[PDB]
Design a protein around this ligand. Structure first.
Ligand SMILES: O=c1[nH]c(=O)c2nc[nH]c2[nH]1
Length: 240
């Protein structure tokens, strides 16, 4: 297959692979920020994703108020505009649901998860350049899935028949990402992402580990997400 010159090639190949897939009830709507938030997504890939990296963080899929708005993984609006310096054109997905509107950089909801993750990175590293010198953050699946009533559907809850071709496409993009960036360690943010990384990357010369996911759905994340993750990283051998 084609040579992957960079992350943007990889994301474009992924979007193409995704565009051929079908999803059905209870999926009613599928959002692909790789298409509607392409300019800010490619900004993030091009400004911060130059190879090599030592460590790759991998999330699961966009939150409605983060990457679905900005094109950036865990991409809370404020942190993407203020810290990363990215603020660009975001159009609305085909069939946008009214309970999950894509206002882009005008979105006024703050995503907790990405606020916590990027805020901790900002606190530990100061500038983006000190972080991205060694690290990167990507999602395994760039799509957001909703029911007809606008409810989120995580990719683990898709019917197997539709899940398998989705995961095949996402695994291929992940392997391509790892061959380009050459990290020593790939870290799933949460259990689902961790399990996909072990599945996709077996036999590569990389270690795979996990950190706690920053969402309020975990008690430890509310008490001390940063201290917890900082411990996990240290147990993995990762300097943060
Ligand atoms: O890009 C993202 N990936 C994730 O897994 C996630 N979880 C919450 N918010 C998120 N953003």
């Amino acid at each position: 297959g084609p040579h992957m010159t960079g992350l943007a090639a990889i994301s474009d190949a992924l979007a193409a692979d995704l565009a051929g897939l079908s999803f059905s009830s209870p999926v009613a709507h599928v959002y692909n920020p790789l298409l509607y938030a392409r300019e800010p997504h490619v900004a993030y890939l091009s400004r911060f994703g130059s190879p090599p990296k030592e460590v790759l963080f991998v999330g699961m899929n966009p939150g409605p108020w983060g990457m679905a708005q900005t094109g950036v993984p865990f991409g809370e609006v404020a942190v993407v505009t203020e810290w990363l310096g990215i603020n660009g054109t975001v159009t609305r997905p085909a069939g946008e649901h009214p309970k999950k509107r894509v206002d882009g950089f005008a979105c006024r909801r703050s995503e907790v998860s990405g606020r916590r993750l990027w805020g901790f990175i900002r606190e530990r590293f100061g500038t983006p350049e000190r972080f991205f010198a060694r690290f990167f953050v990507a999602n395994y699946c760039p799509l957001l899935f909703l029911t007809a009533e606008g409810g989120n559907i995580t990719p683990d809850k898709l019917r197997r028949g539709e899940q398998e071709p989705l995961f095949a496409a996402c695994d291929l993009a992940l392997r391509r990402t790892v061959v380009l960036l050459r990290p020593r360690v790939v870290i799933g943010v949460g259990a689902f992402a961790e399990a996909r990384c072990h599945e996709a990357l077996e036999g590569f010369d990389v270690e795979v580990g996990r950190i706690i996911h920053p969402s309020p759905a975990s008690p430890a994340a509310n008490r001390d997400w940063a201290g917890t993750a900082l411990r996990q990283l240290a147990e993995l051998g990762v300097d943060f």
